[model samples]
Target chain A: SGFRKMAFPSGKVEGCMVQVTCGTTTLNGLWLDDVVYCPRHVICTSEDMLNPNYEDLLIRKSNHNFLVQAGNVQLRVIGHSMQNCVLKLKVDTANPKTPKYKFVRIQPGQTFSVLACYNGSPSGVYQCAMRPNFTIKGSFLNGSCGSVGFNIDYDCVSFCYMHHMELPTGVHAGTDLEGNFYGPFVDRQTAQAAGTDTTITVNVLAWLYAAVINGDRWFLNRFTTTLNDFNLVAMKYNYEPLTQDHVDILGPLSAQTGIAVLDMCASLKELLQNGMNGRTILGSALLEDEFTPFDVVRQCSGVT
Target chain B: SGFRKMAFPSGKVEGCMVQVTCGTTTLNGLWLDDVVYCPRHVICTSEDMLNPNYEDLLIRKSNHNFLVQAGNVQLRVIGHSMQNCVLKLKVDTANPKTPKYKFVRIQPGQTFSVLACYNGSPSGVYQCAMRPNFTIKGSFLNGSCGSVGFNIDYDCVSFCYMHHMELPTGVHAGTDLEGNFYGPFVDRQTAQAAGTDTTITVNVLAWLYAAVINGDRWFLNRFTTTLNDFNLVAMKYNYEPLTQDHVDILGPLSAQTGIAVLDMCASLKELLQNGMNGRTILGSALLEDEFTPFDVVRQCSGVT
Candidate 1:
């Protein structure tokens, strides 16, 4: 578990925070503020440093540059996969407009433990700034350890909505406004002041990322179809078609949660022509109104 | 089993049949024809599903459209997924060039009960348009059954030419007369037209899906590398460099299958810059023979 500066985010997630989750082992985006715990294995913080048993855990920093910040919340999925995964942590606040996710990728057996300098959950599993707290579950093995569920003691009760990234009503998943888009949109920006950059509605951003998203309206338009096509597959796989249980657990989506991540040319093409599985990946984009796997919940395929 | 009107040929493929094969299942074009079946399954196919029971399954539309038909002959990979699966089917024939194939995709739990139809043997899984009968095998669940093998039973005596699609000796996969580099020449027509699309006079293709050899230039070019890329991984797993078993069961090729399918874009980008898995995908505009998968095979980690 080390938090070195990551590559300029290969796709979406900036960093990651991994723990040896106990149950469904779900991780990422619409993060759960609270979850079940292992007491010892939960991702810990400096405050947890005093725990007599804490000394045995392997800890790392959720890289500051690669961290996530939403309204009052902040965290990161820091890891060695920076060169590979998208570098952005989905921050699900009341605003779907708020940056709610960063597509991520992690390596197998990189043996992620925890990190610090951040806050801790009551259980000490969730890193800094999370309210009720969070702890991930599962063995990031062949990637499939079974049904992964991000457990929240109560959703309507404990946490309300998991952060799902989506264009919602105004924009599509790939649509980007100069004022919007990755308009200063991509990467780990120090939670800045909503100055002139426009869409930075007291939000976050990146220039190149915006350029990438907005770079080609043609590309972005095509991405819309790509996202939808994968949505069909995701629905079939239980990845999307968010269930009532999911809503009951996290919350609900603001609109149709478009996939936040899709490598159409490669991911989809590979599967179509090749019938290859384990490669086509999709993260429901906007569950803003709905719930989403978040911070701890939004753990990626788990390979470096 | 649903044979819904999917996206009206969004790209390729027609209908689909899927089933979650209880066994590590397998399926489709970019194929492994004479694959090792679960004897019990081979139980119902030809001398064919019988090859013991050898002679009585319904061979209907190996679903040319629903299959991976690039060149001649035809095929169908039908399954209930065994226990559960999405279903449709592809049947191959030395003849189907008269009619060719249409690729397919289906959803899960889409229960399909019919394992028979059209014709069986000359009896015809081979379609009125084909020669050797073609029947495919694989699991319904995302089609990853394991160590697949393509065997040509007896050839002129038993199986004969399995039917391959190709632009023949000069063209490439994706090299359609239309766009990209490997363009047109894909899609369907009929056999009597023989205008161009061609192969497999009698003998056998190669070890693997060599027979679907003379399929299409555009699609075949793409497959060249699909096979190679997958072969690398397959070799990492089993390394059976072109065996008699392959030809004995299935058929042979048009030329040295070139890899027109290699998306130098995402695939190579991800690799050289990263994955480090065994970079085997190539962009061969075309290569009709000399047993490609082998020279390259023996060339792998150079292992078994």
Candidate 2:
């Protein structure tokens, strides 16, 4: 319902699209052409102003910053401008790096919403330029387009990945990351299913692996013992070693997914610390391979 | 189920008694006579070893470090010495601060277990010295005390407080601290029910307030707007404006308690940011008063 700006560890600013959905909802990062925008919201442009049904999805332009709301769906547009019945895009020279071009657009007849903000020149014609400076301009059927109408559809998909802001619990749920949601499930399968890029997933998993394998001394201590003395096998699939209380909060999907990742970490720790007798070749191979979640588990736990 | 050492923000080491319980159980800090001890476990000294009923509660000693188990009850004791049908207390010289006396004792016939670790001075008679290096030595009626008999009654109660390792969510759950648990509820009532000290509670509330009011800038931005535009009133007692999914993990008690604390925090922020019209004196009073949870809400929100 809102686009919250987030800063990555690399100091790159991107926006997270937070949607208020049924039961326990999940959060994904919304990306555009590889570059990320902040304070993002979906913009719907209607060529037909007389459609009564469109009133529910209209953005009544009366302020510099506002939201687009329709039931549980919402979008927060910051620094937006309405001139000549159309919106304009402004140059963003605020970054420490080279300035970047930004803009938004909505399909003529349909609400093919895309992420955007306001700050630019004004025009009354329906048009968009994707290069030089991404921009959009539109005209309304009515002489004065008070209510800019459209529907809820955006090209921006939720960017998904594993998270570690909270301690490892078997029960995983969504979390707020710099005004946006990070996760409800810290699982690779879930991330993969959501179409997360391999590069992104690997980085996230590596970070998580590093955290448990070498980062937190206390957390690393869980893997110093042998499998017989400590059972990480049960943890790999079930919540035996963890509190099932998360099941009540995250339900089985999010909670179990979280537990699975932690279990994999704990299990891999066992092999690295105690079961490394015949895994040298495979361990070396991990350096050249994709380091997929499946390979990480299968290689570490020696699970079939 | 285990004794885990925890380090405070100031690097103070304290042990938490993690008891594995049911249905989103809460955690409290376990303390003794004012001073805190690390690597702690409950010691149940029984006068009779022949009682069949005590087998389930007996601690079979054979190794230097081991666990005492009965059904779901468990205790991890480190570096224990067994000789002459008794146990000994040893001095801890590992700390940088002035060495403090430490010991353990159990009632003659009752299972008055107390928090302790295995350390020096062996004797066959049941004796305890509370001063000059607190120590305890126990005896068994049998010539050989292989299985130390006892029950699960300990003087140590769980120490309770507010925690901030995880981001604020309407749903609150207990977290693992160091190796022990910190909270499932970030509420004052739950902490009070567990008998948390006023000083401890006050410091925790101040920290929570500081986190939302000043610490995280993005988190602080949530309070810059007015109450009507933001609606923090619903957050005070309810999970509205927060994810209720925590109820799935912590159930209502823990989740609601957590939401209540954060609500109080957000509510206070609203006043400090916007409602500072006629309550300058009351705000000043906060500096002198105990800063109880009640006073915090009433002082900031101006609610009856």
Candidate 3:
């Protein structure tokens, strides 16, 4: 509520954009954009509602449908947090009582689908999340003899989800258009002929801290902060478009989302594009719900 | 149309030398260059036109633009295929209300600016086109509940967008030599030096796909497939590399795209680069795309 939109400082790295969005996720459990706006914030939503109050937690559905093929369902985890991650997925989240599961400890910048394992007919609603992996200390602790351990970084991050469209309409925002839709602000012709650094005004949706009748107006202001990212994708796709899924939004999200190649399968691209608020890296990055392009190649080790 | 790209045997995974020049697109609403390539099987040229005499279905403009923003703009509808794709956009199609709009729900793969969205300010001229994505269910339907999805694993890929200028023109096939321009067959220096079993040739367009013009000639020729995925983003950047915005092209796509990572990231590396044309791994992935060292950590879930 307090932090409004503003361009980040020039020296910011793309991978950090991935991390910022990743920062929104939780190792505790959360999920995504039944819509496609701010997907990076997906980490805040999770199906970990052990109480009947569970209605408050499950934000959106995970991208896959296990429906008829339990044997075919597998959960993969990715890390773009600029650090390694410990992720957990609870299969058939509706059955919070059962321990149907998969847990993965993945490396930074890699896939650990196999890192986590699932058995049987892997079909149904699943609850997945990433563990906040930020513990950096050298030696001491503190309880009598334990008082010598050094705890450099504290740990406190959890799950959540956010998005556009169906999600937007389904939220505190009321409609998907204002907070989630920025396309109209896109001036394609102006863009096509528009050279570098030409910013166009786009209307984005956000929540109001406290509500004022016309307060929603503040969230809908036309701003140019987002156009550049959208343009970066456009520049690339217009130059070379999609082969599998929808590259439209890919180009649209090019700079905005942080993930570059839209690199994963069109499948991931399709899922990520649908509810993007534009923050991401490799597409499967844990529960943070943000997706980035992991142009990752496996290595037993570096330096042969 | 002469040389149709062939599909692999059920067990024959690894490689398929294909090329598709899918152009850019946007059919009323949607866009991406996240193609597995050969998407169009190239639409602007048509087949996707639905009907020669029947220009009947298309769509309307997606959500965007403030009322005052439109001088008299009316969004057209291009139902590339009649269905509901919750896509939203204010395209810069070549035409405002005419078919000049490249409303392509194209077959996957291919572009140019001024090609689809936009008009007026299109003044001198321009370039803009959505990324293509298409996979067809070939000639057969299985049981009662199923429609014939002729699954040959797919046969027609498209004209690709590949890279490393010299990689594109160089070859065991010959040379269109320059620093980054090699439009012949590419044999890695190590491979060229290492010989036979060492297959260091991948012809990836920054964006790519399938089809045939030279019988087997097209597929038989080696053009660095790894180059394009690496270059497309570079091309748009006036030729730089990924600072962020993942190329996921690194996913399971690996050797096929030529970008190194998947370069479908790992799934791509495990699939493409490994059994690649019966010879590949580590070596062929290209520049810019990174392969994060995944000395993964393992986990068993958290909190008891």
Candidate 4:
């Protein structure tokens, strides 16, 4: 046979109710051997004394007079197979040194209530040893103990056993339009592109003015300086444009033709818009005969 | 009145001779004056006394005559300018308290040869005094006396008064060959050339081999090390055949090429003598495409 089942309530313990049932049925002092009780939220039993030896019977009384302390108390029991069958508690009293209390007995299907009483102060820890019978005899016998358990509730006293119980909390800066974070400076590509475009535009304007004035030397010098400045700026940026191949070929072509590639292309586009044969301007003597590309001239001139 | 020229060789005493010349030659003495003398070098004579007081003359004579002693001595005349001097030297044999040596007069131009007599082991010094006449004018009348000068023969002494006698005999070792008389080490070229040229030759061979094996890697690794070693060895034998620029280029080339450029050229010449065109051999079936043109390959391979 197996041991009877038991239950331990968290609050409002029933007092001296050795046997109780649901649906308004109750029984008192049923004299059951396989008794179990819970003081606080732990379970304990006393039917483990079938052999009645000092090791096994120390926790037992007579079969009909079985009593167990279901409340807090400190006790030491020695036996085999009772590894955690030990309980330690301090009774509350006026002087706390001398205290009076009674033991409560429990049987299967019964409930017990535990209330701690003290006069001046009641502050201490309560511990219990729970023994579950695991025998074929269906009785509390020797060598049947489990692990110890403990509980600490200090609602009755004004003292705290531990210290330093607080948590941490502060802010950071910088944000953008939707409250998303942005970097401290403008992006590199946009900044570099803006600088390059401005330089190129200014250089083209200067060259065009010099050309209109027919200052060829001045125009060539300015043109070369501007090209050199552009190259320097590109080098500073470590910029290798996708169109660099086209630019290189066109640069040499324009240098040999003595005409700016971009300007020549623009003039051809204008002539086409006016419904004239673009080839007339494109193949003109001004465009083909006297032109000497700047890059080629610069190379022959040993500017490198 | 101008001072009278003192004559040293005046024949006042027999056997007198002028042995040495101190600054002055002439001296004067006054009688009846207390005189003192320092033996080694100093002599003092009395000033002129213009007065003719009989009491003063008698007192001077008494004091001067009492202090006169024999042996080599110097003289200090207190009163001045009484001419035609004569000092009477006498042996005081009657008094045991008096010194045993007799006084000998030193006449004008008479050399005072030191007596070989020992007095308390002769501390190399002596003193004496003499008076020739009494003065009765202001301070001393018509008389002027001067000190006797002593002369030392420096050549007679083994170690003269100068202390610069213990310098080492051989040349001093300094950095500059021309600046000092000690060494020619400062002329690095000559010094390096003088030593055995074999080690330098070995270094050159090893460096060339390394260059051939490791090419530019060897040059980069041992450029500084080999060059420094070569410089040192060359300096040791004073053989700085190459200028610094030549060495700079040659050093790296030797380290890079493994075979010396000259050696490579000689080998090429030998190959040609063996009826082998270098280009054909270099561009054989196995390496035809691998080999660049002759000039290109030669220039590239010549460094080591």
Candidate 5:
């Protein structure tokens, strides 16, 4: 764990959580709630002290400024803190190997990012170490920090789905509104108050159903037959068959009960149309009824 | 299948079914029913036509001269009707790198009875094929042949239980038999009275109840634990704690049922000693009553 602090023009900041990256993997996000403005004085608190809801105190927006370019790259210390802390980055590349990359130091309170360009092919797994920032008050430090690592596959076009940063409601450009394919409706604040920034982030998950059913097509093709091919396509389009392994694994008991219900339904249909006794239809009635709930759920979910 | 015919100096000649072996692995004794004999000018049946009842047939007492020696080892074939016939010996050593073995060979009846010895360690699974004498009558073969494979690991010796070979009823040399021993009672006279030497060879396996419960250790260790321990004594004598992997693979319905039965027995003892409640005792009693018949049958036949 690491710690960092910063001093602003308005006041001297005592303690704040700083984000650190080892190589490429982002560890976790942190924030600060209570700040004590003191000069050369240590802030004291109980060891079991619970922090406030940092999400409520901090601004809620996607961090879109940091982006990865070609070659080995990382974004470090992008948060608002650290004035004079020394930023250390170590890369080792040896014969069975260690990580190999150049390191650069950046000033505190400034956004720190790195981009490494290799001349030839980048092979093997790599790891790095870094220290973000810390605050010291009369030999007492109060804050938090950490380190992380990630693999850079040379064959991959880009590391897809690396980050899933949630945007504020109604920020369409940074969100997936097109995937949802629905009209944006105004929030309650817009109906009650006058003009304001009353925008809602509309979430659209593109290929949500497709990815769920089809998975990775290139991988599936290796082991499956033509029947699987048709089923995979149907699954991508949200069309489910009566007997599928997915449905069997998910609702085995229900699926069996549904079979019984279908038998009853068939018997009932025959009785109604041909003046047959209800007793004959009763045996299969339970199975017929069982399928009704599954049918309803499927229909409601828009699955064929 | 091997076949032979010999004219003895006297009208009646003493004969015995010699021991059959593929390398050193001795097959079950009951397989000797497949062996047979025929006088000259008699229509010999097909070798495959003979079906030896594993539970019947007795071995002659003094005719134990059928010791077939290979290398420094001598094995006694332990079944009936092995007099004059073609005996096929095959050996597969279970080695994939270099495979070598022989097929069935025909030999003179006198040579087969006097000096037939099966030898060799062919690397694979081996089986012994045998048949009664050859026939040239109405295109019909009565004594057809059959073969038994030496599939189990080496050193697990097997002997004929049904063919007592004139041994007394209470003799306890090969198998464990005690007070609870079931039967070596004489067979029904109906088949034998009609001139066919058909006799039921039944035995009740008696030992401490704990012995039966723990017998599985031999099979479990051989099939799983000590694959490299080639000698039977070394493999059978060692005890190892059952790991989670072993239990996961082998423990299920059968294991659970056995454990439950043991637990019930433990509870019964506690109840009889006034350490358990009436309800617990009664519940266990009910379960015991239900499974008593199965236990009797298993103990009688040595069937798992």
Candidate 6:
């Protein structure tokens, strides 16, 4: 059995496995089809199949058997629904050849896992898994261009998928003595009391450049920036403090990546708070092979 | 009497008026003081008053008289606080030079005017005006990066400044029967029944590129694009219709410029609807010489 990971230009990823069987001496016209097997991940459509020049014998989806011609060759494909189904035929060609048929099946890749801030009874860090189809969705906030908030619908559904489990390893930053994660805050108490959740008020245009980086990092950075800059402007002006809507800010991105918003939130929170270097948050194992938020949105939604 | 319009690099515009009367232009440095008069709009603060380097002669706001020096120059200035007050002083400049002084006062500029949908009883085309202090504020909409919504606080206040009046000149597009200005709308009934409220869902990064156009045109184009694309995606997918929130969409921007939301709404509404070329909307007389929403927000709010 042979297997490999395939990455589509659109950022869609799939794992494929293959097996081949060679028949002893066959006609040239019928050689290739007997030796080739379709992988489970790929669906062979009738659009590319030419008409049957010889015997037009074809079964439906029930048997998953189809015979078609391409120039001087005949292609007979067997689908996953009928894995054992086989076809046997002979052609009238002076040239005889032995061709090996290969069967390929897709082995689904392992889902990603990350620690998240589960806001429930005894709310704290818990490991979560990405969904089969993960997508990140969000929107801007507070009349500001770069600042953003998450869309609650799809995000909530995914985070609740697996039974919650505590993270095996502990993070040194953005967490308190009680082990509760509160990014860029003294503690959950101080975080809750934080005011004016606005970040990067200037250089709003950088949002696009930032979004280009796997798209997911932008969401993580923006959330942390919001907390870090809460008192940034207050130091300059005596403006009244404006509290942030935690739900709007933390909802969607968490669902898409399987990492709890709190985990990524604190990841960035501590990076800025402690002023550390030589480490990364979103780009780590948390999102190594994951499709970028931009690509996911582009594939499911649209693109430039 | 002297008057001229002043344009600040910040895009702020103000008209100033000035006058000067020479008191025989006598003495060395004293000659500049007898003829100097502070404009009615310029407020001279005590922070710059050099502690009466020679006489320590100064008065309270009641008289608005102050004497100070910049190097060898004995300087004295009057403020708008006491428009009628005059200062008489003699300085020792045996060199006997006659220096003249001129006074400049700022006159408020005329408020901009444009046709707008009154959105009141028998709503139709009505002349609206800009407020003394015009600022445009908005937030992105529909889980989109660039599509934005108006901030209700200030926008509504200005559009309501002038009692509704009719536009002197008529726009040939984005309007219909009864002269009601329904921009980019086929008609009142059709525009209201439009399906989705999404626009430029793709190429979202262009929002910043587009926003650079004086900031206001972005709003104008976005609103019109929203209307134009209502059926754009619908034609491709059998999606359900989602009506736009008129308040969130049309509320704030109308107040910034004198142009009513309806005026700009239709101004752009028709540009795409008619598929016309070589014409403009937001950049017209409707917003001529007005501080761009970008500069206004930068000044009144903040900037990159």
Where is model 2 chain B poorest over a 10-residue stretch in terms of lDDT? B2-11
Model 4 Cα lDDT, one tens digit per residue, A1-304? 0000111111111121122111221111111112222111011223322222333332442222222222233122121121122111121212222112222222111111111111101111111111111001011111111111111121111110110001110011111111111122121111211111111222122223223222222222222223444444434433222134434545644554466644543432332233222122211111111111231232122120
lDDT of 5 by residue, B91-111 (tens): 112112111211223210101
Clashes of 6: 12
- Candidate 1 residues B170-235, lDDT tens each? 111111111111122221221211222221211112212232222222222222234455445434
lDDT of 6 by residue, B210-242 (tens): 223223343345333343454344234322222
Listed per candidate, the RMSD to the true structure in angstroms reads 26.5, 25.7, 28.1, 51.5, 30.3, 30.0
The digit string of per-residue lDDT tens for model 1 on A135-183 reads 1211111111111111112111111112111211111011011111221
Candidate 5 falls in which docking quality class? incorrect
Higher-TM-score candidate of 2 and 4:
2
Top-TM-score candidate index = 2
Candidate 3's displacement at residue B29, Å, is 4.8
Cα error of candidate 2 at position A174, Å: 12
Looking at model 4 chain B, report the run of 10 residues with the lowest lDDT sum.
B157-166
Show the lowest summed lDDT stretch of 10 residues, model 2 chain A. Answer: A1-10
Candidate 2 docking quality: incorrect, acceptable, medium or high: incorrect
Interface RMSD of 6: 26.7
The 10 consecutive residues of candidate 1 chain A with the worst lDDT sum are: A197-206
Q: What are the per-residue Cα lDDT tens digits for candidate 5 across A1-304? A: 0000100000000011123222232221111121100100011123211332223322221223222121233333233311111112211211121122122222111121111101111101111111112110010001111111111111111110011111122111100111111113211112221122210100001111111222211111112223354344334433332234333333432343333322322322332234322121111111111112222232123220
Model 2 CA lDDT for position A162: 13
Tens-digit lDDT track of model 4 for B1-304: 0000011110111011111111221222111113221111101122222222323343344323423222233333333222112222222222222212222222111111110011111101111111011100000101111112111121111100000001121111111101111111221112111112121222233233332432212122212234454445445443333234444444444555554444432332232234222122211111111111211222233210
Error of 1 at B279 (Å): 18
* Model 6 lDDT per residue over A192-286, tens place: 22223222211111111222323334334534434446444423433222234432333344454555544454443443344323333222211
lDDT, candidate 2, at B133: 14
lDDT tens readout by residue for model 3, B1-304: 1100111111100111112111333111112111111111122324533322212212221223111112234432222221121112222333222211112221121121110111100001111111111111111110000000101112222211211101111211111111111122222222222112211112231222111111111222322334456445334333333322334432323333333432322232223323233221211212111111110000111100
| Tens digits of per-residue lDDT for model 3, A111-164 | 111001111100001111111121111110110000000000111111111111
Off by more than 4 A, model 2: A1-304, B1-304
- Number of the top DockQ candidate: 3
Worst 10 residues of 1 chain B by lDDT: B1-10
